[PDB]
Design a protein around this ligand. Structure first.
Ligand SMILES: *[C@H]1O[C@H](CO)[C@@H](O)[C@H](O)[C@@H]1O
Ligand SMILES: *[C@H]1O[C@H](CO)[C@@H](O)[C@H](O)[C@@H]1O
Lengths: 395, 594
């Protein structure tokens, strides 16, 4: 187990915010939602030193204020914008549903809203091949950061980024029509990622399919690719991360070795954290942890939302994984054969024999962990059975 | 003055070889009376040097103090090293000596001498030559010997000065000190100067040199990355104290300069006195130039990376036509906040990154390597090394499910015990999709026995078959790139012709015909018989010899009414005023294409 917490202050800043410009106003308020998801879901109300119970409600007040605050950027037709006069942006629309979906857990949303907002993207902004398009009035945004990309490479980023929103908030409006939309889109990402264009593209793409069918042939192919680009310090690895680069793209400059990587490796971390391959994940969060020092800070809120959801998911993957089992072996008809309570302290409780010829039933109620049952059976057969022999012998 | 941004630089640019009292004596002398100054210098180069770029060898005293540095930033203790060791180090430079002297004349005296700037500078140039340089010399000019000023000092221009300041770097101090004006050196020897010159090669000083930040030096200590970045930050804050922006302005467009803890005022020409308040009636001006206030304190880090700093043009805000101060009122740099950690204040050290694939190296450990999943499956549980007796669980890819013993066990052997395991399962997934087609129905997974229907737009149909079915884990079988929808004859042109140049001209019999159309039957007026012929080839030959070659009868040539009829058909051809030509060469005058 590794420690991944937050400074008492850090949170303080995030919750307090800075104020003035409408610009990055939204950017102003997104973090609170994450600092709540992480603070509630991984229970950590306790950090404060004051009264945790009312402090929880203090954030809630800020959280609902902030909830309508985002609505400001919602249009007529339910599509998110920066300015109503402004323009409707396919980018922000996805990014809203992504923020909302995580929040819906503990702050109930306007259901009918979420839906029409969804149906906007799907019915209007999806090609015949699943891929999504940014609407127009194209605007570089300070918040967006590393998102800008070249050639089709941007179709991929966006399709995957909008997939993420739709995955995140699908629960709230499970529509037969938008599940289909997900099917078509997912296929794009699988069937159109493989010859990898960027590390940043590989990663979100990986992460987006990571929120879908995580057993898929093509997908695990992709995940392998990403998993092979990784950087390490110390072997066996103590530290692991990803840098954004391709073999064509070298200059004697500081900028290429540029933060973009924190975002890309954050998408990797989030990908694997879904696969629940903690072995892979450990050197990353140690390093991402270690990152603040090496990194200085996370340049823009975009990655900082993903880093936080990382630390969140991990601290609650640990929790799922701990062994508190209560296994029971019994004969279906004849009596109760023994049964053993298995924990961290007393794992691999025993081996026991099977006495009687009654179907065997191994079975825990609700419990937390991972246990392995082996049923090695021992039998004797004559020589001249087809099973073993193929010839007629004598001597 | 380019303190700036990143700060490496060249020493041809400062031209202030000014010591503690080198500059201070001049400023303090300048308060005594309206003064002008005459500089004379002579470089004496000895050698160059290039400090090698990497793997530099640092000193004990330095490496020492460079260590007793705390991990956590502390402007207090960090600043310390700049005071003691410095800021930059020489990548390259020269070593030797400089004859460098600054002469102080009361501007009243110069006006009394009446010499032009070019004259005055030259009288010092040639007088030095005669008096100190020892050379059998350029002929003097009585312009420099018998003017109203030199006349009052035994014909010397130099001895006219209130005093001189020595900026001589190099050689033995005995010989150097003598070259500065003193009554003791006042009957001194030219002999002195040549002796000094030899001394300079045995006792040089660094002149004419390039620099680079002392920080780039600290690269391989315990906590390099930590202390090196801790120091760039500390470098910024250290810079601010040294700036003279904080000095209050000087009475008369005087530019205040800092040394140590004090601002002494630098005076404009025609002003003197302790703070440039006094002026002889020669100064005939009250224009004031603007100079910045000091910078602001940074604004707290923002909604964006962004942060703010500010000055205003008010220290000596401009008046009655003084120069507007030049630079930035404002400054955006981007910034950050610290969020994750409590414990460490960590130490990273100049490690070396590596793509993971390239290091595959140790087996002493004796755990088993990653094993081989079976076809259509994967290992649930990735590592490089597994301890002996560990299990790894095999599961199957989508649409396939485990049949049997799901585990391999790591043997002390190094070998794997390998299970009774297979990935049988029948659930076809959505096939290798070509952008062109569209399958129906559209699902994530298909059941054993469901069929899909490949369909395309109107003008087109499918290259391979249209209906695949899901049997024994395969279909029956999809092209995987061998299938899309392209229409025959890829302003449409008539059946005899093809398009080639955005203008409808005939397809050539020999060339374009090749793809197997139906065996047609055709009558030929030149032959007076018929022949069975491919269709493509026929519709070409219409162009050339149509009036010779008619359309007759679909299928290979064969007897019946069909044949006797097509014969009549094109025997009655002459009188027919109207022949239609849809798929047939023609429709009779009497018929309609149907
Ligand atoms: C503006 O003032 C500040 C404080 O002295 C410095 O950071 C900068 O060099 C400039 O002089
Ligand atoms: C502010 O800084 C500028 C140079 O950056 C000067 O022009 C001015 O005198 C003041 O020092």
């Amino acid at each position: 187990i590794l420690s991944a917490v937050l400074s008492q202050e850090g949170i303080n800043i995030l919750t307090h915010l800075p104020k003035g410009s409408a610009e990055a106003e939204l950017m102003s308020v997104v973090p609170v939602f994450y600092v709540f998801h992480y603070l509630e879901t991984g229970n950590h109300w306790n950090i404060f030193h004051s009264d945790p119970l009312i402090e929880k409600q203090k954030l809630k007040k800020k959280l609902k204020e902030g909830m309508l605050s985002i609505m400001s950027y919602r249009n007529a037709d339910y599509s998110y914008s920066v300015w109503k006069g402004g323009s409707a942006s396919t980018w922000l629309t996805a990014f809203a549903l992504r923020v909302l979906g995580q929040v819906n857990k503990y702050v109930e949303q306007n259901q009918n809203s979420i839906c029409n907002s969804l149906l906007w993207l799907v019915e209007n902004y999806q090609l015949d091949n699943g891929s999504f398009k940014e609407n127009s009035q194209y605007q570089p945004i300070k918040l967006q950061g590393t998102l800008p990309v070249e050639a089709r490479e941007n179709s991929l980023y966006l399709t995957a980024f909008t997939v993420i929103g739709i995955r995140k908030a699908f629960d709230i409006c499970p529509l037969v029509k938008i599940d289909t939309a997900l099917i078509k889109a997912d296929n794009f990402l699988l069937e159109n990622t493989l010859p990898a264009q960027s590390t940043f593209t590989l990663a979100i793409s990986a992460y987006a399919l990571s929120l879908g069918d995580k057993t898929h042939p093509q997908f695990r192919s992709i995940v392998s690719a990403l998993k092979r680009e990784a950087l390490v310090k110390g072997n066996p690895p103590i530290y692991r991360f990803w840098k954004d680069n391709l073999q064509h793209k070298d200059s004697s400059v500081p900028n290429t070795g540029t933060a973009r990587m924190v975002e890309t490796t954050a998408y990797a971390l989030l990908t694997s954290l879904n696969l629940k391959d903690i072995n892979y994940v450990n050197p990353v969060i140690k390093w991402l942890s270690e990152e603040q020092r090496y990194g200085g800070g996370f340049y823009s809120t975009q990655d900082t939302i993903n880093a936080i959801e990382g630390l969140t998911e991990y601290s609650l993957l640990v929790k799922q994984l701990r062994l508190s089992m209560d296994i029971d072996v019994s004969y279906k008809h004849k009596g109760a054969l023994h049964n053993y309570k298995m924990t961290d302290k007393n794992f691999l409780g025993r081996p026991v024999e099977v006495l009687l010829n009654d179907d065997l039933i191994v079975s825990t109620g609700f419990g937390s962990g991972l246990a392995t049952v082996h049923v090695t059976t021992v039998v004797h057969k004559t020589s001249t059975s087809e099973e073993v022999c193929s010839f007629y012998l004598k001597i | 003055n380019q303190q700036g941004v990143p700060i490496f630089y060249s020493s041809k640019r400062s031209e202030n070889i000014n010591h503690n009292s080198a500059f201070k004596q001049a400023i303090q002398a300048s308060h005594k009376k309206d003064s002008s100054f005459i500089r004379i210098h002579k470089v004496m180069k000895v050698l160059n040097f290039t400090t090698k770029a990497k793997d530099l060898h640092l000193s004990d005293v330095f490496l020492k103090a460079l260590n007793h540095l705390p991990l956590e930033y502390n402007s207090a203790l960090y600043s310390r090293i700049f005071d003691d060791f410095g800021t930059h180090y020489f990548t390259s430079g020269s070593l030797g000596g400089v004859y460098d002297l600054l002469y102080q004349f009361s501007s009243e005296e110069l006006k009394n001498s009446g010499l032009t700037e070019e004259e005055a500078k030259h009288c010092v140039r040639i007088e030095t030559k005669k008096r100190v340089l020892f050379a059998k010399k350029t002929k003097v000019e009585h312009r420099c010997t018998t003017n109203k000023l030199s006349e009052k000092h035994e014909g010397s221009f130099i001895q006219g000065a209130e005093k001189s300041i020595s900026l001589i770097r190099g050689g033995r101090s005995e010989y150097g000190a003598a070259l500065a004006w003193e009554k003791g050196s006042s009957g001194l020897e030219e002999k002195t100067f040549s002796e000094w010159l030899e001394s300079v090669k045995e006792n040089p000083a660094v002149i004419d040199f390039e620099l680079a930040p002392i920080v780039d030096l600290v690269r391989n200590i315990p906590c390099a990355v930590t202390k090196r970045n801790n120091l760039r930050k500390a470098l910024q804050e250290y810079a601010a104290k040294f700036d003279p922006c904080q000095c209050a302005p000087c009475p008369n467009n005087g530019r205040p300069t800092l040394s140590g803890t004090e601002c002494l005022c630098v005076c404009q020409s025609g002003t003197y006195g302790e703070n440039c308040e006094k002026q002889s009636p020669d100064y005939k001006s009250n224009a004031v130039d603007g100079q910045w206030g000091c910078w602001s304190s940074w604004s707290t880090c923002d909604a964006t990376y962004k942060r703010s700093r500010t000055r205003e043009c008010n220290n000596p805000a401009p008046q009655r036509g003084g120069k507007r101060c030049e630079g930035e009122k404002r400054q955006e740099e981007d910034c950050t906040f610290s969020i994750m950690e409590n414990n460490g204040q960590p130490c990273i050290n100049d490690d070396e990154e590596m793509k993971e694939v390239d290091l595959p190296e140790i087996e002493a450990d004796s755990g088993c390597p990653q094993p081989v999943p079976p076809e259509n499956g994967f290992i649930r549980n990735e590592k490089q090394l597994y301890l002996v007796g560990e299990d790894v669980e095999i599961s199957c890819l989508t649409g396939f499910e485990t049949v049997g013993y799901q585990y391999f066990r790591c043997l002390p052997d190094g070998t794997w015990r390998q299970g009774d395991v297979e990935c049988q399962r029948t659930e076809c997934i959505k096939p290798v999709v070509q952008e062109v087609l569209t399958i129906t129905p559209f699902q994530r997974l298909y059941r054993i026995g469901e069929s899909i229907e490949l369909t395309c737009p109107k003008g087109f149909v499918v290259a391979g078959p249209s209906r695949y079915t899901c049997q024994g884990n395969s279909w029956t079988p999809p092209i995987s790139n061998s299938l899309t929808c392209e229409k025959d004859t890829l302003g449409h042109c008539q059946l005899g012709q093809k398009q080639s140049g955005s203008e409808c001209i005939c397809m050539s019999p020999e060339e374009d015909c090749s793809h197997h159309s139906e065996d047609l039957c055709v009558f030929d007026t030149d032959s007076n018989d018929y022949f069975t012929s491919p269709a493509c080839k026929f519709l070409a030959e219409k162009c050339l010899n149509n009036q010779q070659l008619h359309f007759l009868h679909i299928g290979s040539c064969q007897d019946g009414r069909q044949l006797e009829w097509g014969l009549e058909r094109t025997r009655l051809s002459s009188n027919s005023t109207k022949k239609e030509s849809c798929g047939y060469d023609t429709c009779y005058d009497w018929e309609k294409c149907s």
